[PDB]
């Protein structure tokens, strides 16, 4: 029935597992790590099928619980079980966290061989269970917004502003990447409204570190709530390094014909939904110091060689998602300095994109003023997403 239970940590490392049926190898785990734990532009749902294998999952804190089969299983069953496994578990060791999982490997194994024989949600209520489980869980335990602000029109604007950084090899290995962001909030709201803010999972709460800082007004306990400053302010700052959506791939083909010519063809691919427009695209393809000149050709946008820059600069006004484009140049080299290989500087890009390369998505902003007369249904609400290139580099 259920073919496998896998408890994974936030890194997508399988902490603990049990395969109940032999049609579910290494293949299942990496499938679920790749397409769910490290989903990128994938539409989340609790169930997903990949390579004929279905995948159920609950998120608990920093833990993922995941059920798996290759069969026409009882959908509602699987989930209810996973809720009661999380009842039971918490009745031995409290929260469901790596730590607590880590301490209770032997308990957890024990519950599993009881709570779930061969794949069938067998008997498993807390007190009913004592009789068969010998082990014990190991436990472990204003001043920024003056008063009387009135506006005819209660408005709020959110701007998710992100900078995406990349260094990538010629073969397309992300060598390093990180995003830097912030949510700027600009609000004209009467009173002293408490706001309730919700987003997706993507932020947990020269070597870039994952971090997330909030404005003093923010309280944590799920979600974020605050009484905002009036006008414009920064709600949260963050840096992230996992699961970044690299809007462009740059595929370089640099071919040194001898020591005299140099063939450089470069292709960029827009890796986001087709219905979205990236703008202000530049590609900056460098050239070596001893270059007579350059014959460049391209059939999207415009390109020019610039000598003092030692670089070709190719510009494209718009490029929608899931397209390809290509520049080709033929470069000409007078080889004085006899010796010393040209050390290639990377190809860099500029761009602008109307989503967050981190994946961040704003899900709600609820406003509630207690004293005054207005209601969140009244508040006019604009969101915007500006995603921007930072140092976005590909070796060639």
């Amino acid at each position: 029935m259920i073919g496998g239970l896998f408890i994974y940590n936030h890194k997508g490392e399988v902490l603990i597992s049990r395969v109940y049926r032999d049609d579910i190898g290494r293949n299942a785990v990496d499938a679920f790590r790749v397409n769910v734990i490290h989903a990128r532009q994938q539409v989340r749902s609790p169930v997903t099928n990949i390579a004929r294998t279905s995948f159920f999952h609950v998120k608990r804190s920093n833990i993922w619980l995941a059920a798996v089969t290759k069969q026409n299983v009882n959908a509602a069953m699987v989930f209810e079980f996973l809720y009661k496994m999380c009842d039971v578990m918490a009745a031995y060791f409290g929260k469901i966290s790596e730590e607590n999982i880590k301490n209770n490997f032997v308990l957890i194994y024990e519950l599993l061989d009881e709570i779930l024989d061969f794949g069938y949600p067998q008997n498993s209520e807390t007190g009913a269970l004592k009789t068969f489980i010998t082990q014990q869980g190991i436990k472990s335990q204003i001043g920024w917004r003056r008063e009387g602000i009135k506006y005819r029109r209660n408005e709020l604007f959110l701007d998710v502003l992100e900078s995406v950084n990349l260094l990538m090899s010629p073969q397309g290995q992300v060598l390093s990447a990180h995003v830097s962001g912030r949510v700027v909030m600009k609000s004209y709201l009467s009173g002293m409204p408490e706001c309730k803010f919700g987003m997706n999972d993507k932020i947990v709460i020269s070597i870039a570190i994952d971090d997330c800082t909030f404005h003093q007004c923010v309280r944590l306990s799920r979600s974020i709530s605050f009484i905002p400053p009036d006008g414009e302010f920064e709600l949260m700052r963050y840096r992230t390094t996992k699961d970044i959506i690299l809007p462009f791939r740059v595929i370089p083909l640099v071919r040194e014909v001898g020591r005299t010519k140099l063939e450089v063809k470069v292709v960029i691919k827009s890796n986001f939904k087709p219905s979205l427009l990236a703008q202000k695209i530049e590609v900056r393809i460098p050239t070596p110091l001893n270059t007579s000149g350059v014959q460049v050709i391209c059939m999207k946008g415009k390109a020019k060689y610039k000598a003092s820059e030692n670089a070709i600069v190719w510009k494209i006004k718009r490029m929608a998602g899931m397209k390809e484009s290509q520049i080709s140049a033929e470069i000409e080299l007078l080889p004085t300095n006899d010796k010393k290989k040209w050390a290639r500087p990377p190809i860099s890009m500029n761009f602008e994109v109307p989503f967050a390369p981190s994946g961040l998505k704003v899900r709600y902003l609820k406003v509630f003023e207690p004293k005054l007369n207005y209601s969140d249904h009244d508040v006019i609400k604009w969101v915007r997403y500006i995603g921007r290139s930072g140092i976005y580099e590909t070796r060639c």
């Binding site: 730590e99 880590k102 301490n103 190991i138 472990s140 010629p170 073969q171 397309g172 595929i251 083909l253 071919r255 040194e256 014909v257 001898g258 020591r259 063809k265 292709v267 059939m299 397209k323 390809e324 290509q326 010796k339 290989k341």
Partner: protein
């Protein structure tokens, strides 16, 4: 030595929770802070163990915000073990406290100024390890003196050389080229290969910005390499690793020589050539051991010599031998040697004395790719094919690229499909090669093919048509895989739409069959593609008035007219109306042969 340390460590281990662990650590910190703050002196043994316990806790993650003064007193001890632990603490926890630096700097002066090699060692390592400006300022001037003095132990010179290397990297301005130059170079003749190694690393860095100053090292480096690579089995037994004589020194010596052009003195350049050919010979000699550690040491030396050969780019016979020997690594158990061979051959391919050498091995490259499991080795197999491909190769290479594609994993398709489109375009002698390539390209790997590329094919087909009924049959016998995919339907529904005629006569490729087949794709396609098929489909009533009725009743149907889309609803209406209304000479004046393109 330290039972108290062992017990703490074991207690940390016996801990059944990150909570239990944190509790035992804080307990320890409390104890250590007492005893450091306390009134009863600690004997050395205790300062040593407690400083060592704090180092341990540091290395588990937690913060250590004291102890530094106790570690600094250990520098002033005359007990090795106490000193060591002291030098380790400050080497791992570097604190900025302008005072302690001063005291550490005195402790160094004294261990250097002693003449005990061990204490000189700790001192010199501490310097290499931290290498702070203030340290450079205290000692940058003295280190050369220790390095060249006639009386310092070998172990100390090894350490001084590298410490001197560190400070030159961190603080060049403190390491001017003084009067020690020739004595540093001279160490390349030492009897002690460890000293030779240390010196070679230093000089190498120094040669980068100071070549002329160390010009003399070339000859010494050459005489030494060649003595190393020819010595027997009863020579250099100290530095012999799995029967390969001093491999790391050899690699370092071939790397020093990459700071310079070919030796200027003809005898020397001769010697170096004997050397390079001796190494290359050894490659062809079978193993003296079946342990992979032996081939790895031998091939370290092989690869670095190959780099020296490329960088000189001045001995054609060596370059050819280099290629041929890389050529033999492409068939090899070791993924490591395959990877490196393919990599190092991409370098050789861009070079005159070596391009045609590299061509010699296409067969071998196409056969390794064909059988290769590792992704990164594949990638480089393909990168090399791309780098050697010319007029001669292009058809061979492209043929095999396409052959590879039919069974190729997904990882690779994108890069290959890209290189093909490109090679086709740079090199194909004749319009008609191209089209045969692109239609297959699209049949196998079309969802990676650009927009231009499936367009631009048919921008050219016009000017030399004469394969419209090739195009059609391939498109068709393509289309009749119960497999085939989207851009096939796009260009295949386009081709047959426009000339299905040259194959509607063939009786198992009839108009009715043609149609039904397109329509076995229809309700899985996109709209701009149904757009195409809802134009394909109307040219069909005209050329083939035999199946106009089966056409007409898919246009009148609900799904075509009451279609959510503007184009689908626009085309299914318009076209039902063109086949029912006006005339038939007016039908033919609308879906005719297709007046052809210009040239850009």
């Amino acid at each position: 030595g330290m039972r108290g340390l062992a017990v703490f460590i074991s207690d940390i281990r016996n801990c059944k929770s990150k909570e239990a662990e944190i509790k035992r650590i804080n307990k320890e910190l409390a104890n250590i802070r007492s005893k450091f703050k306390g009134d009863k002196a600690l004997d050395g043994y205790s300062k040593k163990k407690y400083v060592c316990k704090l180092l341990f806790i540091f290395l588990l993650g937690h913060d250590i915000d004291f102890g530094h003064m106790e570690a600094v007193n250990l520098l002033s001890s005359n007990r090795y073990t106490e000193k060591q632990i002291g030098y380790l603490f400050i080497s791992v926890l570097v604190n900025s406290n302008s005072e302690l630096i001063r005291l550490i700097n005195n402790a160094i002066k004294n261990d250097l100024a002693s003449r005990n090699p061990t204490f000189m060692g700790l001192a010199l390592h501490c310097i290499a390890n931290v290498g702070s400006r203030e340290m450079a300022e205290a000692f940058a001037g003295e280190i050369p003196k220790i390095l060249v003095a006639g009386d310092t132990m070998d172990s100390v010179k090894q350490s001084a050389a590298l410490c001197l290397l560190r400070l030159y990297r961190t603080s060049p301005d403190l390491v001017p080229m003084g009067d020690w130059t020739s004595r540093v170079v001279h160490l390349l003749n030492d009897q002690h290969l460890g000293v030779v190694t240390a010196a070679t690393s230093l000089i190498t860095t120094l040669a980068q910005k100071n070549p002329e100053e160390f010009k003399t090292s070339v000859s010494l480096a050459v005489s030494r390499l060649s003595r190393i690579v020819t010595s027997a089995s009863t020579d250099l037994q100290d530095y012999t690793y799995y029967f390969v004589p001093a491999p790391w020194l050899s690699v370092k010596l071939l790397r020093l020589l990459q700071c310079y052009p070919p030796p200027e003195d003809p005898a020397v350049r001769g010697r170096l050539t004997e050397c390079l050919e001796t190494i290359l010979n050894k490659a062809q000699e079978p193993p003296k051991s079946k342990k992979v550690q032996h081939s790895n040491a031998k091939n370290a030396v092989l690869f670095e010599a190959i780099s020296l050969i490329i960088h000189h780019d001045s001995e054609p016979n060596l370059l050819v031998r280099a290629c041929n020997q890389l050529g033999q690594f492409l068939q090899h158990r070791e993924t490591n040697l395959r990877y490196l061979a393919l990599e190092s051959m991409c370098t050789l391919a861009s070079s005159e004395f070596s391009h045609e050498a590299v061509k010699t091995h296409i067969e071998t490259v196409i056969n390794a790719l064909k059988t290769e499991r590792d992704v990164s080795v594949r990638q480089r197999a393909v990168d090399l094919l791309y780098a050697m491909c010319d007029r001669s190769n292009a058809q061979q290479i492209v043929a095999e690229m396409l052959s590879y594609l039919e069974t190729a994993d997904y990882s690779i398709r994108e890069e290959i499909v890209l290189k093909v489109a490109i090679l086709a375009e740079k090199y194909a002698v004749d319009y008609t090669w191209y089209v045969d390539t692109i239609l297959n390209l699209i049949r196998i790997a079309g969802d990676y093919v650009s927009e231009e590329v499936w367009y631009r094919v048919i921008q050219i087909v016009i000017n030399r048509d004469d394969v419209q009924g090739y195009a059609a049959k391939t498109v068709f016998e393509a289309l009749q895989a119960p497999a085939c995919h989207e851009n096939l339907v796009k260009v295949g529904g386009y081709i047959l739409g426009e000339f299905g005629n040259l194959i509607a006569g063939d009786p198992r490729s009839s108009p009715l069959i043609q149609f039904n087949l397109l329509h076995s794709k229809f309700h899985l396609c996109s709209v701009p593609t149904r757009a195409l098929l809802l134009s394909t489909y109307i040219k069909f009533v005209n050329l083939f008035p035999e199946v106009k009725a089966t056409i007409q009743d898919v246009l009148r149907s609900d799904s075509q007219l009451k279609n959510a889309d503007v184009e689908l609803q626009q085309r299914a209406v318009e076209y039902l109306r063109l086949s029912t209304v006006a005339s038939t000479d007016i039908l033919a004046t609308v879906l005719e042969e297709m007046p052809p393109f210009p040239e850009r």
